[PDB]
Amino acid sequence: VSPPPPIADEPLTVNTGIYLIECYSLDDKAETFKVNAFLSLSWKDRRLAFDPVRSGVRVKTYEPEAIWIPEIRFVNVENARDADVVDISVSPDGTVQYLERFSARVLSPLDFRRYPFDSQTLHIYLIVRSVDTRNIVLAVDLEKVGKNDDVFLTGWDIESFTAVVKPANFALEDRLESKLDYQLRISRQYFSYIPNIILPMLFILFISWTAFWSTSYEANVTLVVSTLIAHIAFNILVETNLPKTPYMTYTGAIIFMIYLFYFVAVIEVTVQHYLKVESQPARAASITRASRIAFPVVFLLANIILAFLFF
Amino acid sequence: VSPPPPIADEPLTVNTGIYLIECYSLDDKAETFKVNAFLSLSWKDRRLAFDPVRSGVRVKTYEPEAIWIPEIRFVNVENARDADVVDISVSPDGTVQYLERFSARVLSPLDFRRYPFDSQTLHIYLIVRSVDTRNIVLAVDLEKVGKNDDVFLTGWDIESFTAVVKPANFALEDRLESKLDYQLRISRQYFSYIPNIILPMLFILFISWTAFWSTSYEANVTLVVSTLIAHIAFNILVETNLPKTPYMTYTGAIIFMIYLFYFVAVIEVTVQHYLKVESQPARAASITRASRIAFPVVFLLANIILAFLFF
Amino acid sequence: VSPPPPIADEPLTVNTGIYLIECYSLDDKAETFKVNAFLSLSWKDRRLAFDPVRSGVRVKTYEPEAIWIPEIRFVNVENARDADVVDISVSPDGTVQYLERFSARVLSPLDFRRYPFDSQTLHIYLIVRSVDTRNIVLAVDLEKVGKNDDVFLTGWDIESFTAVVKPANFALEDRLESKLDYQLRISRQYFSYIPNIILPMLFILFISWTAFWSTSYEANVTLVVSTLIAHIAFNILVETNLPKTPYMTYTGAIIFMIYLFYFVAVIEVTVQHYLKVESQPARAASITRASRIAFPVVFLLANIILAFLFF
Amino acid sequence: VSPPPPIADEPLTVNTGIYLIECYSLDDKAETFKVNAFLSLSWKDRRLAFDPVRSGVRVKTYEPEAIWIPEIRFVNVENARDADVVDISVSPDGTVQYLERFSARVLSPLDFRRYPFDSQTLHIYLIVRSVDTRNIVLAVDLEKVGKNDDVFLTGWDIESFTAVVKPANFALEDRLESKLDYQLRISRQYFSYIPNIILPMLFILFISWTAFWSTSYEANVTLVVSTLIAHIAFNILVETNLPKTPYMTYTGAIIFMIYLFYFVAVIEVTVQHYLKVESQPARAASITRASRIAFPVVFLLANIILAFLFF
Amino acid sequence: VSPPPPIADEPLTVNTGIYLIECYSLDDKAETFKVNAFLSLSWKDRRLAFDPVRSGVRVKTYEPEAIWIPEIRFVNVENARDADVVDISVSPDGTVQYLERFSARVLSPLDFRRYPFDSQTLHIYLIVRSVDTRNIVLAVDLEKVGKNDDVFLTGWDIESFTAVVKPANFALEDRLESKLDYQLRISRQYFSYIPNIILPMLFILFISWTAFWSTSYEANVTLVVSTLIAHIAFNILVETNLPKTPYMTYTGAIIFMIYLFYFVAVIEVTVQHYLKVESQPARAASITRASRIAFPVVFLLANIILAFLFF
Ligand SMILES: CCCCCCCCCCCCO[C@@H]1O[C@H](CO)[C@@H](O[C@H]2O[C@H](CO)[C@@H](O)[C@H](O)[C@H]2O)[C@H](O)[C@H]1O
Ligand SMILES: [Cl-]
Ligand SMILES: [Cl-]
Ligand SMILES: [Cl-]
Ligand SMILES: [Cl-]
Ligand SMILES: [Cl-]
Ligand SMILES: [Cl-]
Ligand SMILES: [Cl-]
Ligand SMILES: [Cl-]
Ligand SMILES: [Cl-]
Ligand SMILES: [Cl-]
Ligand SMILES: [Cl-]
Ligand code: NA
Ligand code: NA
Ligand code: NA
Ligand code: NA
Ligand code: NA
Ligand code: NA
């Protein structure tokens, strides 16, 4: 078996389509997802053409070994996809209709800047390397691009699965390469983060602020230090679920800013005590009374600035 | 080998049956389970018919390669099932009786709303794609559907394994697909959650309420803050064992509600101290005495409302 | 190749034997173990018989493909065993002596009721499905059942590896099945649990009881609450190493009971303080003096009751 | 299929090239990385020579099994590479152009001395063992060495992918061996470590130093001990992400040095209290006032010395 | 293909050699290591002898299928080794020279008694089972035993790779089995354990001893209890990195002994307070002054006894 010879000097168009059956294991740390889907390939092989009246049959079925099939690969996969040929059908004019069911672990970078209120565009890149006989160009058959209704990616909302119809045709190692970008638009289900991380973290911070209504240094030290320890636990929990980004994430920014609030609260609690011992509680009382409004106001305004910078 | 030709224009019925040998690894976070079972297929191939008199035999055994076998796939599997053909038997009328032993990792969504007092319906979807020659239909042979008595899924009670007899008949990528739903009804063994999570969590909360019988702010701050830290540990332990759900879970609702009780206790403890310093323990004593009944009553009533909303 | 035809209508006895070479990875959470062993099969195929005089040879060696070999499977394996045929030898009378070396991950339930002072019986189930031509029955060749002296399962003592000689012959999906039960009796090496979990847990509890020799509520609250936090850490450590059981485990019972002791200690510490503030330390002193004997005595007697109920 | 014969007594040159498609999973603990690339091999096998007029084609395509292909292995891989032959093209003179796409987990030691401000040189070693008939020598075809622009290794900056053109030709087990060094220079994206580990760790340390502005031993003990516990959490978090090195790492050195600062702070806090009880707060006040400048100055100077020693 | 027939009744000698290429993943918990090496086999098969004059060749290359190759297995491997035949050469006298490159996960028990100051001997056991026509005995070809200079096992120093020249011949299931032991002597790089575990653990213990210079029960309770919690964290960290041993380990012994020191310190701190309240600080002062010397002296002497018992 060899590639079909050209009529003129035209390239061989291989019409593609991916129909998603399953989407699972979107690992944020690894920036990988798992996909189980149908891959459909269609090209014309004039050698395979037949007379439908003389042959009786309207379609002829071939085994992969029996005919020429273009070597389609996925660019962004960990290892080569596991594939099982579903069907190969040849029409009287010689149009080959290949279909396979594959499973692969796809490497697709994520943007965590707005986490956990972020949306992503997952990619699946199809590629074909040209041959010495003739160049192979990829196309999108929109009728064969889709996803089944039941496709669920845990903790994500699937927005759309579409292909960028114009292929990226470039030279690689003195041969032509035809690349196709299949995009899966998803958005994170941020709900869980509110009762699991966001609200517990705000509560422990507000509990620390009750020290602004207490003159007891020993009890204030306990309050602020203990709540800071609880905050560290949440910070660690959050960073163990995320990859190391060279940029600041929304959650990471909030978490870091809260450390400064704990630090300033310690300074206040210390200032309040130093003045009390120094026989001047009049100055301590004014600082503490100010902190009661200052701390929540500055926190609320700081978060407004942060949200603005990130969204 | 090609599919058996129709006598008239009837579809080709492939009678199915799944006999569960093993059920293991029900991952809640991944919403996947592992299954090891027998798959039995039965269809009529008139080309394989023989006269038992001149043949000498009543049944003829074939190798998978020797005859046409329908391409049955599982919809909701991670990767294609690992299968080993056990037996292929042909009766004189050409009724083929295929049997294989398979192992597969099944993707089946779970409903955590009532966790850990929840029941699930695990699905195993069988599918066959029709060919150009004819429409391949799936059926259920109820005599060949079951599970062995010893089938145990750790931390779960297996209620029933039944098949939805009527198949789904739809078109996918210009060919008819015939899907069957094999349902495995299970219910969670909630027992362990009571001494491991529920009761320890209630005890640490009740220990915090002993601050309503103490005038010592330093000791109260220690009590409430330290028990809140213990509660955070339990919250983290629970959420590390569950997937991120876009809905509130029963356990999650209880856990979140308890954070508010700790927060209100801090407010009370602070109010009690502010009044004591302000030379008015008469107001502090009345608030503290009220909290002694208020906190358990509100907790008990809140849980009644929660349980009602969830069950 | 087809099964050997019967002389009369008797079944084909396949004499089995498992010789354990390795035992590893006994996962308590997963209730699975890994085994690397020799599987020996022996049956008579009269068609393979030869004259040892004219043949010159006393034994004839065959390749698996050359002759009929019975399809022996393992019931409780995760996936089908990885096997490599070591040897196939035929005696002049046609007695086949097959030997293979295999590796498999075995699913075998564990009883954690007496953990970590528990013993288990691991099972390896051999099975053969009968054929249309003749019935196949399994037997045990005790000369070919054993384990090598070096077989070590980390954290376990291997007591015995024996087979239940009488097979379980039952009907499954209109065909006969012959099941064999290979039992591996083991017992847990409980030593490590004493300095790693048991003793540290008792020490933190005894440290809490020093509050019965202190009138300082602030220091008592610190003592009891902090040691309760340490106990939670040990509880979590223990439950992360065990599966969720629908029954109470010995360690789990002890751990839960200790929570009540901490809870009652808090009540005592609170009662002692309430009476001190109420200007009556005479009542507080009598309660505290009683607790000094009551707490250890009740703890020692409670553990006697627990140990009795469990052993 | 033996190696091609020599014209004179020269070795057979196999021109190599590695084109990186994907770089992922750089495990610091395991000192391994995963690579997905194109491997191109080119050698002359005169036996494959053809007349393109007689043959009809200008280039002949062969299946790997059909012709002699040099046994190229990777030295530093865990297991043999998962390879898929992309193309084998033979030109009329017998020049073979082999291309394959592979994936492999490469073992390459890392130097953690300057972590997280460290750069690495990852290695990919190609090897060929000489045969009976003639010696096989490796070469680099620079036209076939590179990496695609999109190649991203999470948490790392890829500097260059180059090959050491002169092979390492040495004798091993009485036969010649030809080794090629492909180097991938990378540098760590240190950014994340600043808000995640470095700054939180400095803040908890500075919070501890507020005890130098307090005379309360009970509050100072709380401050220093609690912040030391938070530091332990960060130390553990850091060491769980790193392998055990026989040398001191930059981060490890900083972390260790901070333990001494906490230890000396405890000594100070104890000294301050012992003098207060001993009725001499004049000595305590002078020590505490000194510590206020001493602790930050010594910390800042110590870090200057550390950074100097490491960079 | 059959084994070479014996001239007299002499057993066949298969000369072995292992040349280590890679050593990685020494899992302490699993007591397994991963190896990538060359296996060389050499035996006389007189049937393969040829005249180098007539044939014109001085060596002959065979494919594994073409000739008899002895079934060499590894005793202590998880699953059968992944091997790729590198070369098979026959000399004119019929001396076969087989070479393969393998990779395997080796199960080799470790002795943790002196951890982390322990040395191990890793084993690689080669085995051959005799056949009905000839007894096979294994030998060591010292010229073909080695390791490459670059072989690195992370956190370990590789001392030597040698073979026990005299095999361990024994009968197994009525057939001779010839076993060979390849010893890889390694010693642990203990350095890291000093700044990561040993020193932090001693510092937290010494910080606890500052309570012997304080009369404040509330501050002493805080000091000793909080440092005990930090010690529990280190104990857990250590035991999560080690398997459950039926013997006491050096680190485990030290860690356990330190629990007693914390427990006795609590008793002292309680005794000191009970005497202070009982209006007799004269007795408390003498006990506390004694503890200042007693605690470090007993600790230092206890460690001398421990180190002596273990080394
Ligand atoms: C009170 C005393 C102090 C208590 C000490 C508390 C410290 C808690 C220690 C943190 C444990 C977090 O757990 C650790 O975090 C890292 C952070 O990137 C995560 O990341 C991990 O990813 C990979 C894959 O798992 C591993 O190769 C590596 O071990 C680790 O980097 C993991 O989830 C876990 O290995
Ligand atoms: Cl393809
Ligand atoms: Cl691919
Ligand atoms: Cl099938
Ligand atoms: Cl399938
Ligand atoms: Cl078999
Ligand atoms: Cl099996
Ligand atoms: Cl190759
Ligand atoms: Cl390789
Ligand atoms: Cl071999
Ligand atoms: Cl092996
Ligand atoms: Cl023998
Ligand atoms: Na083909
Ligand atoms: Na078939
Ligand atoms: Na479609
Ligand atoms: Na066979
Ligand atoms: Na070849
Ligand atoms: Na052979």
Side-chain angles (χ1 to χ4, degrees), chain A residues 11-51:
Chain A
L12 171 65
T13 277
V14 178
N15 293 276
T16 74
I18 296 181
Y19 183 87
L20 308 183
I21 296 150
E22 296 303 321
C23 277
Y24 52 110
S25 306
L26 194 147
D27 200 324
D28 304 311
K29 275 188 101 62
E31 283 165 68
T32 63
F33 71 96
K34 289 183 191 289
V35 65
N36 183 298
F38 267 156
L39 175 67
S40 74
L41 303 170
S42 179
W43 63 99
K44 181 132 79 181
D45 191 320
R46 260 167 286 267
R47 299 170 298 178
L48 295 182
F50 63 92
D51 187 21

Side-chain angles (χ1 to χ4, degrees), chain A residues 19 22 24 36 40 58 86 89 99 101 103 144 154 189 191-193 196 199 210 213-214 216 226, chain B residues 31 71 74-75 77-79 107 129 132 172-175 217-218 225 239 244 246-247 256 270 274:
Chain A
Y19 183 87
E22 296 303 321
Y24 52 110
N36 183 298
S40 74
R58 304 179 286 101
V86 174
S89 282
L99 180 69
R101 195 188 169 178
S103 62
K144 300 216 138 68
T154 298
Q189 292 178 343
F191 176 86
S192 62
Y193 297 87
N196 293 349
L199 292 176
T210 70
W213 282 267
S214 169
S216 181
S226 296
Chain B
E31 284 164 67
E71 285 173 10
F74 283 69
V75 186
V77 286
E78 290 235 333
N79 309 98
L107 176 66
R129 192 154 209 270
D132 202 82
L172 173 53
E173 287 213 7
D174 268 278
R175 294 262 218 262
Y217 185 67
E218 290 90 334
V225 168
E239 56 184 80
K244 291 166 193 187
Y247 52 83
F256 181 77
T270 309
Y274 195 82

Side-chain angles (χ1 to χ4, degrees), chain E:
Chain E
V1 284
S2 56
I7 49 107
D9 204 64
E10 74 287 356
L12 175 70
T13 279
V14 177
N15 293 276
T16 75
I18 296 177
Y19 183 89
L20 307 184
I21 298 150
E22 294 290 324
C23 277
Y24 52 110
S25 305
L26 193 149
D27 199 324
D28 305 310
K29 277 187 99 62
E31 283 165 69
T32 62
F33 72 94
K34 288 183 187 285
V35 66
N36 194 304
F38 267 154
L39 176 67
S40 76
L41 304 170
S42 179
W43 66 96
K44 186 185 180 75
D45 181 357
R46 261 172 281 267
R47 299 170 297 176
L48 296 183
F50 62 94
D51 184 25
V53 180
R54 285 192 284 243
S55 58
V57 283
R58 280 166 242 257
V59 284
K60 274 193 199 163
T61 309
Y62 289 91
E63 278 290 285
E65 294 83 2
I67 57 141
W68 179 84
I69 288 154
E71 288 175 11
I72 304 290
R73 289 174 295 274
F74 282 69
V75 189
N76 59 340
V77 284
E78 289 238 333
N79 323 290
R81 71 175 186 280
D82 179 1
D84 292 290
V85 177
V86 175
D87 157 78
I88 298 162
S89 290
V90 177
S91 65
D93 70 297
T95 312
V96 197
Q97 288 236 263
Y98 171 99
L99 180 70
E100 63 152 65
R101 195 189 169 180
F102 75 87
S103 91
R105 196 186 178 194
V106 187
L107 185 154
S108 200
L110 308 168
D111 191 349
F112 295 97
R113 275 165 257 257
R114 292 180 186 192
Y115 177 100
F117 309 97
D118 62 305
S119 297
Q120 300 302 321
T121 296
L122 305 179
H123 301 270
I124 303 166
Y125 297 106
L126 285 204
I127 199 122
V128 74
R129 191 181 169 82
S130 293
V131 292
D132 200 273
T133 30
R134 186 177 203 174
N135 302 314
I136 315 116
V137 143
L138 290 188
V140 177
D141 185 338
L142 295 158
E143 223 89 81
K144 300 215 137 70
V145 183
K147 57 186 195 71
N148 91 89
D149 311 275
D150 319 312
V151 175
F152 86 101
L153 190 67
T154 302
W156 293 92
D157 290 312
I158 294 131
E159 252 75 51
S160 57
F161 183 63
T162 65
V164 181
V165 287
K166 199 74 79 83
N169 304 339
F170 61 98
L172 167 55
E173 290 192 10
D174 264 88
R175 290 258 188 86
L176 160 71
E177 222 98 14
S178 191
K179 192 167 121 290
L180 266 179
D181 176 18
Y182 280 77
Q183 286 155 348
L184 180 67
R185 292 180 185 174
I186 56 160
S187 73
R188 197 175 240 116
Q189 291 179 343
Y190 62 85
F191 178 86
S192 63
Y193 296 86
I194 300 153
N196 292 348
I197 290 123
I198 302 152
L199 293 176
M201 208 181 283
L202 296 162
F203 290 135
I204 56 131
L205 170 83
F206 303 158
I207 280 152
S208 92
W209 295 346
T210 70
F212 303 134
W213 283 267
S214 169
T215 47
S216 181
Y217 185 67
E218 32 269 310
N220 290 358
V221 160
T222 303
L223 255 168
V224 187
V225 168
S226 297
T227 56
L228 172 67
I229 273 144
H231 178 75
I232 290 159
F234 277 104
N235 183 16
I236 293 167
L237 180 64
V238 168
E239 55 184 82
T240 65
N241 303 351
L242 277 171
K244 286 165 192 185
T245 55
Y247 51 83
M248 212 77 106
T249 56
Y250 180 57
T251 298
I254 293 172
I255 290 172
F256 182 76
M257 181 203 58
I258 294 163
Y259 274 97
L260 307 152
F261 277 87
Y262 276 103
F263 183 76
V264 176
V266 168
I267 307 303
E268 188 281 337
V269 156
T270 309
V271 166
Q272 184 184 6
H273 180 73
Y274 194 84
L275 294 167
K276 198 183 187 71
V277 178
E278 226 157 42
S279 313
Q280 49 194 83
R283 292 177 64 185
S286 46
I287 282 153
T288 320
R289 277 189 279 103
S291 307
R292 294 169 181 192
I293 298 113
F295 274 76
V297 163
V298 175
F299 186 74
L300 188 92
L301 294 168
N303 270 93
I304 286 152
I305 298 150
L306 263 190
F308 171 83
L309 282 161
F310 277 89
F311 300 89

